[PDB]
Design a protein around this ligand. Structure first.
Ligand SMILES: CCc1c(C#N)c(S[C@@H](C(N)=O)c2ccccc2)nc(N2CCC(N)CC2)c1C#N
Ligand SMILES: [Zn+2]
Ligand SMILES: [Zn+2]
Length: 842
DNA sequence: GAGGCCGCCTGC
DNA sequence: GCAGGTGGCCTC
């Protein structure tokens, strides 16, 4: 019933291989695809390509199965084409008895004309199926949710009869995962030194720079012990009655829990211990490095980093021995005086670049010169930016050097004007993108303004952030919400992608884009891209990890045309508060992460509010002067970068809103200490600038949950503080310095922590929003010391805008332009990944 | 036009 | 229970 076809081609040990076999009516050669029934008959069939056939002398006839992955098993889930399979690196040997049948599985290769085949309607993108036999077009990575073009690994001349792409690639992966040694330098008594070694695909030579975790070594400088603030001192509970609502010690925006950045070492010796016979123990690779001092690591503590470049190091003669496995990555560390180009052109010329000028001696606590033994393009993509705003994303991409935004669609006119101001020679459309795409599809050349419409082939990269009004909830889709989504700007954007078929595609959105409607918006977006034939993936980035003093998690969908390389997500550059760095995403109770490997540390120190705005001159509440004096040079590396090279005699848009007299009193009665907000307000009468009065907040009801003051006073300001009693309108009080509504509903809003909250110089911004309001959602918008709301220029700094980036409109328009924008440092990191792909194209 | 006011859901 | 994430709507 099961019989071989011929004699054996190769017999090794207990196995004997054959090329063709016969099962009960059928003949199978290596290369055919088959089906296998799981032990659970309710689960669907498994499908695999046979890669080898043989017989084991103690178990019987065997074959090697390289499994396919059903589309429902990918992140696409139920939205997958019911007949679409995906190549995966999964395989196993299995008895031929498990084979159920032979199935036809076709490879649907994109045509040479793929770029012109777009134009299918949203319904055909969302729900259209292929309508043929089993087919695959893409390889799938399950831990990163990456759909990519199938690998082109070639078969051996000695291992062709039994070759398996999956086995070959898994062996490649393991062999690059294990660290090895290379050209052997010199034999010593106790160890043997090498000139080079390799780890995770990176080549480390003697003299290269290594990233190490902060635990890898310590410095000879005594890390002088700071003092955590003693227990919260008791305050006058009748003067600051709401202070009791600060029983949590957690400070929003604080960097007290932010990790330390990497240690930087220079490889002095790569070496292995010798076995007693003299041969090296090459499974135990050690390295000897010279400790580099960051400025903040010298006897001058943290303040030494306020002015220094973020990549400035101090050479030292201290040394350390660590395990090679501890190396977190390679980096360049150059002596500045020997550098061919200037220090700025160097630092801006590539990743992981550090330089040193002086040398640090901890024993002497002095800076001297380092010993002598310490010495030794391509065309931009034409880009269409949909829902551009003032152009933060386009600016970041331009800074990466990959894009010229030739076309932008922005319906809000002041943001369109700002994008024009910053991007002359780009065509900015203010029409509905649906109207534009329909005009293009109808054969139109120009819009009603005379502007030339982008045609197929003009658009080489497509990026944008589409709003998600109507379906931004978590509840499941119904008919109404699904219709609103099918007629949505997200789907319109995908239609743009399908029509123009650019080389690269980026959808940016709020973090929760990945969870909307039980992750259905995400799943349908990926489904559309796959239906177009794109390679694609998704992930969540934290903008603060790329060089801004702000927590801003954004969702990122990346797509790359067939023939391209699918970009990686950018590795974090700066350490950041870990609680602001939850980037994982759960889809159908499966956890996906990105390719990011820097989880606990990083190469650059975190950017603080001090780095962001310590150089801006003091202004009053309601500052309106559009052009003022900086009153001095930039102070931090970040300020030098954003102010730029050419000297700027004018500081622009350092204006603030003119909050009312009551709000101004409140603000100037918020303490300057970190973590201060409305709960530290005093309960006093105060006369306002308009001569009116602000009265005490009187406590009129017993909150049995929160109790009473140390003086015995009540803590409720309304009858609703009782069990089921409703709001007595007479209990509402007006023109109180302590706003009445915050104690009124604070028990169910985490005591409205952060409202009327000050920023911290050592800390970061909460998410920069379109209109900073101290009693709104994100109400931590007060200046660290000045009695005002954060300014437009300060918000721009928190978003990482260059100071020369022109805005447009009134102050609320400009706040909104800044708030809506993608932080250019984040956009630039993504763009550099895209550039990697552009450079590494076959 | 600007300020007071403040639900519902999720991950832990 | 705590922290985070989403602005909009009466009202004068
Ligand atoms: C934290 C303060 C707050 C916010 C905020 N940020 C909202 S955003 C909500 C809406 N406003 O529609 C919305 C939902 C979906 C999309 C866009 C906006 N909503 C709040 N609620 C007050 C009573 C209102 N009827 C609605 C619920 C509160 C509070 N407190
Ligand atoms: Zn295999
Ligand atoms: Zn009430």
């Amino acid at each position: 019933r099961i019989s071989w076809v011929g004699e054996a081609v190769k017999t090794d040990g207990k196995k004997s291989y054959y090329k063709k076999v016969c099962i009960d009516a059928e003949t199978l050669e290596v290369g055919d695809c088959v089906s296998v029934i799981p032990d659970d008959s309710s689960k669907p069939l498994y499908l695999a390509r046979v890669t080898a056939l043989w017989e084991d002398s103690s178990n019987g006839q065997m074959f090697h199965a390289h499994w396919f992955c059903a589309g429902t098993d990918t992140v696409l889930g139920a939205t997958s084409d019911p007949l679409e399979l995906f190549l995966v690196d999964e395989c196993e040997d299995m008895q031929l008895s498990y084979i159920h049948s032979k199935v036809k599985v076709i490879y649907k290769a994109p045509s040479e004309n793929w770029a012109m085949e777009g134009g299918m309607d949203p319904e055909s993108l969302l729900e259209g199926d292929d309508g043929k036999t089993y087919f695959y077009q893409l390889w799938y990575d399950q831990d990163y949710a990456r759909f990519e073009s199938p690998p082109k690994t070639q078969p051996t001349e000695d291992n062709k009869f039994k070759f398996c792409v999956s086995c070959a690639r898994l062996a490649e992966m393991r062999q690059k995962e294990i660290p090895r040694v290379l050209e052997q330098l010199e034999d010593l008594d106790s160890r043997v030194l090498y000139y080079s070694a390799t780890k995770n695909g990176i080549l480390y030579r003697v003299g290269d720079g290594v990233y190490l975790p902060p635990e890898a070594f310590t410095f000879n400088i005594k890390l002088s012990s700071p003092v955590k603030r003693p227990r919260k001192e008791p305050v006058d509970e009748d003067l600051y009655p709401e202070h009791y609502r600060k029983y949590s010690d957690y400070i929003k925006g604080s960097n007290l829990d932010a990790p330390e950045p990497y240690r930087i070492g220079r490889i002095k010796e790569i070496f292995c211990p010798k076995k007693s016979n003299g041969r090296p123990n090459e499974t135990d690779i050690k390295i000897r490095v010279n400790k580099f001092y960051r400025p903040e690591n010298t006897h001058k503590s943290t303040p030494a980093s306020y002015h220094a470049d973020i990549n400035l190091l101090y050479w030292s003669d201290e040394e350390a021995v660590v395990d090679f496995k501890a190396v977190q990555g390679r980096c360049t560390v150059e002596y500045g005086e020997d550098l061919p180009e200037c220090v700025q052109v160097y630092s801006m010329g590539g990743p992981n670049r550090f330089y040193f000028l002086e040398a640090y001696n901890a024993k002497s606590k002095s800076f001297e010169d380092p010993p002598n033994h310490a010495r030794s393009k391509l065309p931009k993509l034409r880009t269409l930016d949909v829902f551009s705003g003032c152009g933060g994303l386009s600016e970041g991409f331009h800074q990466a050097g990959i894009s010229d935004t030739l076309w932008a669609i922005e319906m809000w006119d002041p943001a369109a004007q700002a994008f024009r101001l910053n991007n002359p020679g780009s065509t900015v459309f203010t029409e509905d993108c649906n109207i534009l795409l329909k005009l293009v599809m109808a054969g139109e050349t120009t819009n009603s303004r005379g502007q030339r419409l982008p045609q197929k082939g003009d658009v080489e990269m497509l990026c944008g952030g589409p709003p998600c009004q109507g379906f931004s909830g978590m509840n499941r889709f119904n008919s109404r919400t699904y219709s609103k989504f099918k007629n949505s700007l997200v789907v319109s954007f995908l239609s743009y992608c399908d029509y123009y078929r650019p080389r690269f595609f980026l959808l940016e959105n709020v973090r929760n884009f990945v969870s909307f409607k039980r992750s259905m918006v995400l799943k349908l977006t990926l489904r559309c891209l796959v239906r177009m034939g794109y390679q694609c993936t998704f992930g969540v980035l934290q903008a603060g990890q790329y060089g801004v003093a702000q927590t801003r998690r954004r969702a990122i969908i990346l797509a790359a045309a067939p023939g391209e390389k699918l970009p990686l997500f950018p590795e974090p550059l700066h350490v950041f508060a870990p609680r602001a760095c939850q980037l994982s995403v759960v889809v159908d109770d499966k956890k996906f992460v990105s390719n990011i490997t820097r989880l606990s540390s990083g190469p650059f120190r975190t950017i603080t509010v001090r780095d962001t705005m310590s150089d801006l001159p003091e202004v009053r509440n309601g500052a309106s002067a559009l052009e003022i004096s900086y009153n001095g040079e930039p102070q931090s590396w970040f300020q030098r970068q954003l102010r730029g090279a050419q000297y700027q005699p004018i500081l622009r848009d350092h204006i603030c809103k003119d909050m009312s007299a009551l709000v101004a009193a409140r603000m100037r009665h918020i303490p300057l200490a970190p973590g201060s907000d409305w709960r530290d307000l005093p309960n006093i009468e105060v006369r306002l600038s308009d001569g009116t009065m602000a009265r005490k907040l009187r406590y009129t009801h017993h909150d049995r949950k929160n109790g009473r003051s140390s003086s015995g006073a009540l803590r409720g300001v309304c009858s609703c503080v009782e069990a089921g009693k409703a709001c007595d309108p007479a209990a509402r009080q007006f023109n109180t310095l302590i706003p009445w509504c915050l104690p009124h509903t604070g028990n169910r809003h985490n005591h409205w922590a952060g409202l009327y909250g000050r920023l911290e110089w050592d800390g970061f911004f909460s998410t920069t929003v379109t209109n900073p309001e101290p009693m709104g959602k994100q109400g931590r918008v007060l200046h660290p010391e000045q009695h005002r709301v954060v300014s437009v220029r300060e918000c721009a700094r928190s978003q990482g805008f260059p100071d020369t980036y022109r805005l447009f409109g009134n102050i609320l328009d400009k706040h909104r332009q800044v708030g809506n924008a993608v932080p250019p440092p984040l956009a630039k990191a993504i763009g550099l990944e895209i550039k990697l792909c552009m450079l590494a194209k076959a």
